[model samples]
Target chain A: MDWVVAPISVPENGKGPFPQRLNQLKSNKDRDTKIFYSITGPGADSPPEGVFAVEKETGWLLLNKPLDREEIAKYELFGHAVSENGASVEDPMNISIIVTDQNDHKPKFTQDTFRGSVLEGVLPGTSVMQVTATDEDDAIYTYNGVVAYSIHSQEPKDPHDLMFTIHRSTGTISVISSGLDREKVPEYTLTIQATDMDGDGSTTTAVAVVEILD
Target chain B: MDWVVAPISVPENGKGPFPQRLNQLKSNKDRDTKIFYSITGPGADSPPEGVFAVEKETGWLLLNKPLDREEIAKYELFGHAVSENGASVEDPMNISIIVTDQNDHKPKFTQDTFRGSVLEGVLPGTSVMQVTATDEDDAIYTYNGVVAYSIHSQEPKDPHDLMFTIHRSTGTISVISSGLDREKVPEYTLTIQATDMDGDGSTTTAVAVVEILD
Candidate 1:
């Protein structure tokens, strides 16, 4: 009549790799108590590659990765097997994956405008300047999931073309060629990008303006 | 009192290490001028080793190392400086640095708990289970960050003297030397921790429980 079920270990991130966690379950004694496991979440029915799963006998649940905020807010477990009735039961267990805060979301900028300037006679190939940005997520390394720069706009009509080149790893910007004249083209606009493959696909970008002086 | 200021180049972050965004003073040749440049947000303002800085002349910023949410915030700039003062005796100029966003926060668990089962008569060196947690910053490459585990608590410290030992680098939990009996020590409670030194330090932990079968 009375069965003892193992205490479930719900991670702070909410979701679990159910399949792996289920493997940890075991029966205390060969009692008539039948154990069953189930999961509830956004993709509970069709969990992701390393999301959720359960064990038939031990009633153990495993989560592949941490839970997402959106998924946890709308999650429910249903359809469990019962030993006494020898039939499927509705919502046998209410498993809640509490979401603990992670640096999952990166930092974002309000505007995408950056401006700077240099002397008219500055030599080409000279390190103009370096720009940088950051994300909140942990594990993001420089050059791995950091910021990079480039010139997004081009002058409409100019005898000599000016180009902005960026350091692929350090996010440094420099003038590739010299054809800039304060008299003709006083300023130039450029676009830059900061990415973090580590923290999912969250991204941020900003703009830069270069001015020429006589 | 009118004067011509040199053109400025804002690299990116423009907080420290890199040059800040320079301002170009509008001169008499004002023909509806527009300036443009690129800027990016540094992930987090990790303390001790990692610090964020922007260039004084180039509008470039650099993050010394990874980021931490508690130490910093998302959608905020670490610091800012004036790369170029568009200020002339006649016309004064001002400068501003624009920050961007990126997916920098990694996924983290609240705690580390290892759940597993052992046969009633399992030997002393039997492996019960492994406790592991990961950071969401980056999963593809180990360089992003690695998960590590440690024990924080134990229950009923007396007769059997059961203890949980964890592998610092691998985040594995194992029994050092077992005198476990399913009947006497049917279940055990442990507190585990998950940390990412390479990634953001939004450290999280989880709990693990073990049940024995006869």
Candidate 2:
């Protein structure tokens, strides 16, 4: 019966000199007998081949080039230990190679622009609207997944300097200052900012157009 | 001067039998002189300690236990090779160990339940609302990051067996069958499904409450 070996990992986007040794497969029988090793499966002899190579005499597993995690995440291969006469000395074992993640992606807004309407004489603390952004990094990593929202800039800040406040945790925009006179500023344009890692990491911005009605 | 070595990778959540050999650090000077290798860094000797171990004489690097990519994605360690008499044979080289990703997380809805409304006798292809779900896995992987939406089950399927259809890629729920009767069904409850891997991988469900009004 074939046995399974513990899964191993290799990072994505490896800058290698080509044919970099990753890991070695060893057998207890190699102490006394001359053992030959071979790898067969996807990423080896099948499709996506040449990403991995194994030496027949040393059992050293080598990486061919850089791999992108977006294309594929994990690869499974079989390792075989053979004798000089090409007879199987041991059952084939399963080898798993996993690709890790990197914060190479920035947060993206679902829409290019968002629109909302509010009364010109609306009282302070009135809720406006919520905007959202998505990140393509691993969400489990706080530095990559936790996103914060802020008002990057507001256009036409007439009659008031700061008119809107955004909930950093949520993207909900609310009125922080009382306002009136739609004739003064008929509409307001907000540049919304979304940042990963609680506003400490990568950032993305979107536009929100709020029309004031009398 | 200290040199930098190419980064190496190890998989997250390793099912090791304890002290699993990951890779080896070798120097050309080891061929002639007796050398001792030591690793020092966050994973080797500082916080999150004992996760990595290095053999002083053989220069073999070993993993102590399972690691979670969510906690920390990459680790930087310094490797030193010294002579038997405690003399520096080679400058300390920088080593990088990256944690690879796995499909261990499921898609999660932005909210436990979503509420939307539609007027009675709505025309076909009228959009009701769009729901969103987030996955914690590496978004670069198609099998882990790409999320698709579907209606798992619907309650009060009156006047039609399937009254609504969801855009698999966008999560936009729309009326497929027209003439939704408000008298027969005042409200409709739908179980929404969010699946990763373009609807072929893991699945998560959320509740969507849609009210029918006159």
Candidate 3:
């Protein structure tokens, strides 16, 4: 009796913590097929580093980690025996694994702009505005959740008659020593920063403007 | 033995959902402070549609819905009662309430760059890639995810060849036919969309590029 071998391709990138590449091969017509996969390279005999296994009935292969680019090129697998003639064929089938990239980076803002206003003649040490920013990661790393702000720039001069201060811990923007004049200085421009460090290299930022009125 | 009334300036934006404007008066050194607030304007007197008064504490005003610009401006209060001993003089305390934004819109793809790839000469019906996205509003609304995809562009035109089909329910990308030639179509570009009905205008799109190699 003659035997036929079918091939399949498992995508490189799949939903991941560790991506899995899978492929299925089946016997033609009404015959049952049994398949076995083995890595045939330098470490092929050693059973690849991560967990790699195949389902007996479905001929589905699963790899725990993403396959290396060149390694996939050199990667080889053999499927032994197709039981079609009421017996088993001696030759094995072959298949390949490929890995793809995923856009796992969540969208982020560099700095969020917060707007606030106070009376022009308010005293110093008065809280004017609090600026904050956020990230797309979950929990404290999510939007507005893990927000922090800092003064990057102050327009119209520092140590001027109107001075603004920011609370490092609370992100509170306040008037330091209020000599603010509504007619002379109706608005204050401050650059604010926001960041999220979920430790996964995902971060973003925003800006804030505070206007003081009479 | 007379109470002193300190003049304070209110911001043009008035106060936020928490009614910071009213709360500002409470910090005054004056004792026995009492304040009155009412909406007198034509639509201003009535709470905006969908909003309800959840709680009104000594210095707090809570609402079910987010406060609008007009509602904020409508927040008006006057401190009442003067103490002869000055020490007994009281002014309205602080008004604070956390008004949260509601998620209302489903997410939509903003760009046309969805992409994915597979090995060259791969067989038909191969699962190539998966697209993912998120919505931000409430967990119940934002977390319930929905996604869709389509082939926006393909190289080497062939009516039935090099076409990508998406699994309507899973957002899984796969090849539609068996006649894909890597040499003719090395890569595929797609547009993907994600939506959350419970989200407040929270929608996003992503591009997926799939490359096929021999």
Candidate 4:
């Protein structure tokens, strides 16, 4: 009387017993006559090997093994309704297998220590330096690859004031306050932390040496 | 029999007449007995209203109307196999209709004009400012929302040299060449462009006014 809807999704790093059932296939016309179900496509009979399989009699879709989003993000399959006489009985169904992102990678900095020099007596809000980090997880997914930067700690606890601020979205660090004296504090060691999942997920830290030059 | 495979997908912002057929549902057990098909869950008869419908006799899934990824990213439906007397014949089918993203949204700047001042005599690679743009397209799909930044042109034609460089991945604009003269040109107007699809798809432009401080 009506139409079916939607695609099935499986996590990329899902632990599964082989041949995990995803969904079932069926034909309403089967009530009047005999019909056979079959599937063909990238995950089924094509490349990417045997990641998926379809039952001909039961019409159930199954995942043959685990999936990795980094390798292949998605899989497309075509389902068929066939007659006993080896003829197509119904229109093919478009099956999509989406490998949802998993936070399998942690944020990593480009260098062990980022070095930058700021002249003494520079005005507040001056551009200090920029730190960069890369995440190997799915970049398009915000939770997986969107990194947020933060200042974990400064080596010297003397001025415990917020002297520098790092842009959470971009890794650019800027001088937020005054009191940068080359004579008093020649150099400052800062621990910059990069956290994925908007600072709630996996995190990695790097060192930043900000020198106050005369 | 082997298991069936995959899910179905439809694009968002798709143009169609009413009730576009997506795929057929089938059960191979109908060979010896009679089997009917039906569908339940969200797009079929639930909250999403008439977005999807299944022909009970034909088992073909249909899209009743257009889809918007922004409105609803995906729809989930369940297919049912039943006997002529209304008895369950097989397990439920999980149908997923994904609204693939389109380049419907152009990259838009967060602010009208990004204003920042760099010191008149700062070293090269000095950060001027960060310009950002947000794309409303599906961020999970790179081609839909991955934005790249570039310098279209600079207003002052005197210095035809490369004065600044913008990071393609991030919108951080950094000074690449050192030319210090507050009296020569007090300000420079750079036409910054933000493009989706990694600089190949839709694009939008914004202005960056870098004022030379005395």
lDDT of 2: 0.76
Query: What does the lDDT read for residue B135 in candidate 2?
Result: 79
lDDT digits (tens) for residues B1-214 of candidate 2: 0101345666565542678776677876776788888889999999988888888988888888777886888999887888888887777777677776654566889998999999987789999989999877666632446688999888876778888889998889999987687788888999999987565456779989999988
| Candidates 1 and 4, the one with greater DockQ | 4
Name model 3 segments beyond 4 Å from true: A1-214, B1-60, B63-101, B104-115, B139-162, B168-170, B198-204
| Pick by TM-score: 3 or 4, better one | 4
DockQ of each model vs. true complex = 0.01, 0.03, 0.01, 0.04
DockQ of 3: 0.01
**lDDT of model 3 at residue B98?**
25
Candidate 3 chain B, poorest ten consecutive residues by summed lDDT: B1-10
Residue-level lDDT tens digits of model 3 in A106-142: 3344345567888877766788766654433223212
Q: Give per-residue lDDT, candidate 3, residue B122.
A: 69
Model 4: residue A49 alpha-carbon error in angstroms: 12
- Which regions of candidate 1 are displaced past 4 Å? A1-22, A26-59, A63-66, A69-111, A137-147, A156-159, A195-205, B1-214
lDDT of each: 0.46, 0.76, 0.44, 0.76
TM-score of 3: 0.27
Which residue runs of candidate 4 sit more than 4 Å off their true CA positions? Answer: A1-214, B1-5, B32-34
Residue A15 alpha-carbon offset, candidate 1, angstroms: 10
In what order do the candidates fall by TM-score, top score first?
2, 4, 1, 3
Task: Give the count of colliding residue pairs in each prediction.
Answer: 85, 3, 52, 28
